[PDB]
Design a protein around this ligand. Structure first.
Ligand SMILES: Cc1cc(CCCCCOc2ccc(C3=NCCO3)cc2)on1
Lengths: 255, 40, 273, 236, 236, 59, 40
């Protein structure tokens, strides 16, 4: 009586149940694991807070309306302030982590709409100015708020044009990245497990984000007659196999 | 025959002949069998 | 290898063509799941689509130019193209660039070919064979200032001397600092509020510098350098969506404003053929 | 001294030749490789992942909407969409498949075309997708369409339908750039019965459509893509 | 006559290639080698010998005094010295380590920083040395400093203290010429308790400081040093 | 609720030492279960014994 | 393959792979053990 459909994920002191899942994606078919010695470089023993950092943090909720263009969060940024995960983050020189991402959106059998939930490794954004204008730090570190693709261009911020993925590629091809759809008629959640993907064994958690999670409405939300025209979307994310190394004074970052 | 000492100096590599699209085409956690229902 | 097996009528409870794309998988459906097929063999291996093959041919990555002329009274050799350099990079010319950016991280050895041809714009006499010197100047090395500085001694820095009209060829191991080169980097060099964003911060590979060894003749001679790059021993990770809009800058993803629709509009209906 | 003779071609530079060269950095030790998920070995590995087709090409500036094929409730017998199968041009051209095919001169193989339905769960519909092999015109009505490769799709719990365009061909390779002799057919879709919405519901519903290549597929003779060009070298 | 083809690169002179050549002096017999103590095989052998760092760089012309770090009796909580760790520049630059690092482009590894105390034997002191890994600012007070790599040094019979800056890094190589992304941290030193001089004694005492590389160390990609240049050829 | 409705609730247990949470952000950092209302009508949350002292007073 | 008769005409030598810093780092007459007191 197991269905692909019902699932439970327990991680730390927190549990999620979905009764309307559509399997789960594990990026590149690899599950998060700690850093092996053969791959290690820094000689420091690392710190593995385990259950105090590897639990589920639910970010603040978004509201899908008929005019929504899509939202974008960066990792580990989105979690920069969650509990002890965040403290560890500002206090060590280097850290590394994988995540379980669970995006939630329920409706009824009269609604229609379909969101794309995708994880993009190394999502370098484009400046809407063109040329070689850079995208300032603050703009690519929105924190739990994430970036709202239907917000206005700002100065020093990225471009927010959806048919171009914020980088000069077409929305249609985002499907080459680990992703899952939430089609109100099928699905009510999306779950993706992200292994740590980098060109170095461990890195800085503040100067470099290693994935952007993106939720994009593709088939517009259509509510039943005289229904309220909107649904909330909630994102809950859990660091998994986290390791921190090179402890010290506590980083100070712009803004 | 390599005439040179360093590995960078050798010619192109030879075909992976690796080929396994499943990391890209089927990264699902619970295995899906073709023919069985997608969602049970 | 069979490309298609033989398959006949079906009346089952087992439907391989109904799936749920919401899952993120592309189910491996074949012609024989939905029509009646006959056996056929592949006769093919997929040899020429190997990434080593795809990135393994020489591509032009840079065209520069230097001239041989009397430097007498020139206050800025660099500025007179008495010698010139190049801030090594592989993203400046954009044919090879789109190919590499199909991947996120890439690792390979490089084979460089340098072709140098001469031009004599101002009606001339006898051209004495010019010899070009290409020398690699890595980060933190005395950058050269005149076309005949102590720098050109290049006692510790690899340099090649070849003749204009000829070609020079040599191969450099993968010089990246990390395990792969980042084709993309969503980071900064540090957490400052105004520091540049991108890879440009990451691919600090130093520059390459060219000059003519010959002193000047009575006329002036323009030498134009073309650098070709061939990846050998390629390794590529994490495929990405291909580049759709035009490029504007080395190392940023930025596209031009008021660009044009990249998807061709139908001449007719959705229903049109 | 061993006697030699040099042949025609000596001194040429062929960008496609593969030989040894001296290393400029003798004895240098590259950084160790660490493990990174996601390694690609063949472009054939990636063109099997499906991506969305902007089938609804009828707009005037690129929009998220050209990915949506609309469906109308209560129409009978009528046609949902049509397209030829020049995978290197037209709707296909910006898709990952289209985009890679363009790096090669010839292609052969089967294509997989699937449609995922997004209408309310309490609605229902039966569509017919038809592949018309080279030699006939794009079908003009379902009767015409239904006599070639087709699948009646019944919209249900299982949200997507995967149609295969089996390789139908005299010549074993076709050109990726559209060519007549080498042309591959048409793909059309019609109401089999009709879309029906539940009460309290209204308007258009949309289908999303994807394209990917079967394991069947072959691409050969690499060349340059018409999809990218430039007028001056970029700088930093 | 055997048929050949010459490739691109024929006739080039690459200063780094390694091939055979005819000897100009056929059959000549070199002088026998005799034994000489001191043979060097690797530059890695010598950068492990420690040499003095002109830490006290604050003078205006080079002097023996910039090797001396002064210490004041009776100060509490305060800071003895500070420096970043750009081994290819600044204090490090003229040291043997600094001087060799400059012949290479990349370095990786642990550094050994030691301090030898020279105050009267009847005095006493407790100092804290702190290494701050990349990512934070140079510490501004001991509290800040003590939260990173540190050693409380107790001045005793044993005159020197050897602090190691363990390799703390994401990227496995850093640039020897100072670079941000690639930067290595800061090194600071503060009074832990304070220097105390015996009676009949007065003034400043000094610490000498050395730097050498751990056996850990790697240097790669040789290049030319900014530390030497010239304007005309020398003559006899 | 009617069978054709849907809802997702979070239940949170806050162990001794902090105040009753004032908003979900605060609540979600302690023991919690996201409950998805479905066919299966009930959700069972456990308040695991979190305690220094091994017994508490009932009053 | 050497094509030439004299030894000077051969290519570069091959890595010492000798490496022993102790003549430079520890030329002390009585052996010092790390961990034992420097001066007894
Ligand atoms: C990404 C990415 C990859 C690359 C290429 C890096 C190549 C390493 C440095 O390139 C050279 C170039 C020239 C020489 C040279 N030595 C003597 C003459 O030319 C040496 C290294 O650039 N960006």
């Amino acid at each position: 009586g197991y269905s692909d459909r019902v699932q439970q994920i327990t991680l730390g002191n927190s549990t999620i149940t979905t009764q309307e899942a559509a399997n789960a994606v594990v990026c590149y078919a690899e599950w998060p694991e700690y850093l092996p010695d053969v791959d290690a470089s820094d000689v420091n023993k690392t710190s593995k807070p385990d259950t105090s950092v590897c639990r589920f943090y639910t970010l603040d909720s978004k509201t899908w309306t008929t005019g929504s263009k899509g939202w974008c969060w960066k990792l580990p940024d989105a979690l920069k302030d969650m509990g002890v995960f965040g403290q560890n983050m500002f206090f060590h020189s280097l850290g590394r982590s994988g995540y379980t991402v669970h995006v939630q959106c329920n409706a009824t059998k009269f609604h229609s709409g379909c969101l794309l939930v995708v994880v993009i490794p190394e999502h370098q954004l484009a400046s809407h100015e063109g040329g070689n204008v850079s995208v300032k730090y603050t703009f690519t570190h929105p924190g739990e708020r994430g970036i709202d693709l239907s917000s206005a261009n700002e100065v020093g911020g990225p471009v927010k044009d959806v048919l171009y993925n914020m980088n000069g590629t077409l929305l249609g091809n985002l499907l080459i990245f680990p992703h899952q759809f939430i089609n109100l008629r099928t699905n009510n959640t999306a779950t993706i497990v992200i292994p740590y993907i980098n060109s170095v064994p461990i890195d800085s958690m503040t100067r470099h984000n290693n994935v952007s999670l993106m939720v994009i409405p593709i088939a517009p939300l259509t509510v039943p007659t005289g229904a309220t025209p909107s649904l909330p979307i909630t994102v809950t994310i859990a660091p998994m196999c986290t390791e921190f190394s090179g402890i010290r004074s506590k980083s100070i970052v712009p803004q | 025959i390599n005439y040179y000492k360093d590995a960078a100096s050798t010619s192109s590599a030879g075909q992976s002949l690796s080929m396994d699209p499943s990391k890209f085409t089927e990264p699902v956690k619970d295995l899906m069998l073709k023919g069985a229902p997608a969602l049970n | 290898t069979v490309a298609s097996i033989s398959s006949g009528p079906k009346h089952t409870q087992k439907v391989p063509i109904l799936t749920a794309n919401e899952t993120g998988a592309t189910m491996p459906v074949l012609p024989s799941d939905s029509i009646e097929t006959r056996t056929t063999y592949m006769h093919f291996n997929g040899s020429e689509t190997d990434v080593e093959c795809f990135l393994g041919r020489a591509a032009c990555v840079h065209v520069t130019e230097i001239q041989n002329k009397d430097a007498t009274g020139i206050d800025n050799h660099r500025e007179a193209k008495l010698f010139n350099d190049w801030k090594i990079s592989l993203s400046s010319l954009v044919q090879l660039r789109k190919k590499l950016e199909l991947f996120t991280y890439v690792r390979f050895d490089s084979e460089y070919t340098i072709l140098a041809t001469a031009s004599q714009p101002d009606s001339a006499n006898y051209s004495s064979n010019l010899v070009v010197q290409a020398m690699y100047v890595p980060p933190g090395a005395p950058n050269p200032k005149e076309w005949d500085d102590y720098t050109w001694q290049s006692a510790s820095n690899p340099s090649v001397f070849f003749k204009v009209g000829d070609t020079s060829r040599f191969s450099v191991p993968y010089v990246g600092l990390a395990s792969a080169y980042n084709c993309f980097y969503d980071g900064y060099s540090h957490d400052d509020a105004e520091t540049q964003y991108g890879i440009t911060v990451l691919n600090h590979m130093g520059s390459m510098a060219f000059r003519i060894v010959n002193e000047h003749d009575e006329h002036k001679t323009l030498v134009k350098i073309r650098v070709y790059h061939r990846a050998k021993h390629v390794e590529a990770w994490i495929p990405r969506a291909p580049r759709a809009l035009p490029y504007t800058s080395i190392g940023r993803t930025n596209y031009p404003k008021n660009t044009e629709p990249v998807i061709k509009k139908r001449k007719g209906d959705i229903k049109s053929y | 001294g061993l006697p030699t003779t040099t042949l025609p071609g000596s001194g040429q530079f062929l960008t496609t030749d593969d030989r040894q060269s001296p290393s400029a950095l003798p004895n240098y030790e590259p950084t160790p490789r660490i493990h990174i998920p996601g390694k690609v070995h063949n472009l054939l590995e990636i063109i099997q992942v499906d991506t969305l087709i902007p089938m609804n090409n009828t707009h005037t500036k690129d929009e998220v909407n050209s990915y949506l094929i609309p469906l109308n409730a209560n129409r009978q017998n009528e046609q949902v969409f049509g397209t030829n199968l020049f995978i290197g041009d037209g709707v296909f051209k910006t898709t990952l498949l289209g985009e890679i095919v363009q790096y090669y001169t010839h292609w052969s193989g089967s294509l997989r075309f699937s449609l995922m339905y997004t209408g309310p769960a309490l609605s229902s519909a039966k569509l017919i997708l038809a592949y018309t092999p080279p030699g006939a015109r794009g079908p003009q009505d379902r009767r015409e369409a239904m006599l070639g490769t087709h699948v009646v799709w019944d919209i249900g719990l299982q949200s997507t339908i995967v149609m295969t365009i089996p390789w139908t061909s005299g010549v074993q390779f076709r050109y990726t750039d559209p060519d007549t002799y080498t042309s591959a057919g048409f793909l059309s879709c019609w109401y089999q019965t009709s879309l029906i919405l539940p009460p309290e519901t209204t308007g258009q519903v949309y289908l999303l459509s994807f394209i990917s290549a079967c394991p069947d597929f072959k691409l050969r003779l690499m060349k340059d893509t018409q999809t990218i060009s430039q007028t001056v070298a970029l700088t930093e």
